[PDB]
């Protein structure tokens, strides 16, 4: 529950500097409050991490990672501006720039309809600037999702526009934002090239095939998540609506492409073994399904080209959503794609 988070009140004075105004959002580890500094009058987003000692330790690592990637670009290379940290008694507090709602929240306000394709193009360019920078810093975010991409404008300036819905061609109204600038947040699980690599990364629905199949992962795993984000920005819904790995894997074959024979072979030697039919070198589907509903769910999955009506964006998305991680393009290469010109 969200009651587990830091107890606050309007008019609170944190560390003899920050005046609490309101709550901006909650995670599972931290509560983010909008604060005004009493010395400079500037506004900040203060993330108050929970009392627990293990979350304090990870927040320190998060602070450390954030500090390393702060730069002098105009838009901070589309990475959330981090200004420093302090302790409020037992609480770790991280100081950020104040940002607007997530791209997910905007989807929610738009009735889970996708953004207009013109706006998708611009969000895409801006997210890629951030990913290209992280690549140059040898950093894998590991938690790319529309919830972790915030609108640069904290005032959320928008107006209603008319769009033909992608599914049926029905004329509907959605919100277009004035600003198209974005910032990446939530660098807690972020991993440098030289650092330790965990077995499971990503939010389940944005998880890369090589992570699920336990084949080892690198910075190219972020690229798979990015493709899921983009599909969601277009349709307003998750590309992979699932809660278990086996179903998730079978969905990948129905929507994108069959899993490369070499990857299924390398999976038999790892913890991805339980997903592979060793003899036939194929997915253990529908053998290892959990119910008939799970099978009907995977059967109901349309291939990507039926979902993505735009031709250049479809080609763009297939480039990204490559099951083989070695075949995925880098952010630098994607910025040269015809769709973004
Ligand atoms: N700079 C910011 N400006 C405005 N809102 C923010 C900002 N940073 C975070 N938030 C909001 O606070 C929520 C939690 O931020 P986050 O850094 O993800 O917290 P966390 O608990 O450490 N990680 P997670 O458990 O994965 O959410 C986000 O989902 C946003 O809604």
UniProtKB/TrEMBL annotation:
Residues 18-340 form the Protein kinase domain. This is Protein serine/threonine kinase-1. It comes from Plasmodium falciparum (isolate 3D7). The chain holds residues 535 to 875 of 881 of the full protein.
């Amino acid at each position: 529950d969200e009651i587990v988070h830091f107890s606050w009140k309007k008019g609170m004075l944190l560390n003899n500097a920050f005046l609490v105004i309101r709550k901006m959002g909650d995670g599972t580890f931290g509560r983010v409050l909008l604060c005004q500094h009493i010395d400079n009058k500037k506004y900040y987003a203060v993330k108050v991490v929970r009392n627990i000692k293990k979350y304090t330790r990870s927040a320190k690592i998060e602070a450390d990672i954030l500090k390393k990637i702060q730069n002098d670009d105009i838009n901070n290379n589309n990475i959330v501006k981090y200004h420093g940290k302090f302790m409020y008694y037992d609480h770790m507090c991280l100081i950020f720039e104040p940002l607007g709602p997530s791209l997910y929240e905007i989807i929610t306000r738009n009735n889970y309809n996708g953004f207009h394709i013109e706006d998708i193009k611009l969000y895409c360019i801006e997210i890629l600037k951030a990913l290209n920078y992280l690549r140059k810093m040898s950093l894998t975010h590991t938690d790319l999702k529309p919830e972790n991409i915030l609108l640069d404008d904290p005032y959320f300036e928008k107006s209603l526009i008319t769009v033909r819905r992608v599914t049926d061609g029905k004329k509907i109204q959605i919100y277009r934002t004035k600003s198209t600038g974005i910032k990446l947040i939530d660098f807690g699980c972020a991993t440098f090239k030289s650092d330790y690599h965990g077995s499971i990364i990503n939010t389940r629905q944005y998880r890369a095939p090589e992570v699920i199949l336990n084949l080892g992962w690198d910075v190219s795993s972020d690229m798979w998540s990015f493709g899921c984000v983009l599909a969601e920005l277009y349709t307003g819904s998750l590309l992979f609506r699932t809660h278990e790995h086996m179903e998730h894997l079978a969905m990948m074959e129905s929507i994108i492409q069959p899993i490369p024979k070499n990857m299924l072979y390398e999976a038999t030697k790892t913890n991805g073994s339980k997903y592979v039919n060793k003899d036939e070198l194929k997915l253990a589907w529908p053998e290892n399904a959990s119910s008939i509903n799970s099978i009907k769910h995977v059967k109901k999955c349309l291939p990507l080209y039926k979902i993505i009506k735009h031709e250049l964006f479809c080609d763009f998305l297939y480039s990204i959503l490559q099951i083989d991680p070695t075949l995925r393009p880098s952010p630098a290469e994607l910025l040269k794609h015809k769709f973004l010109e």
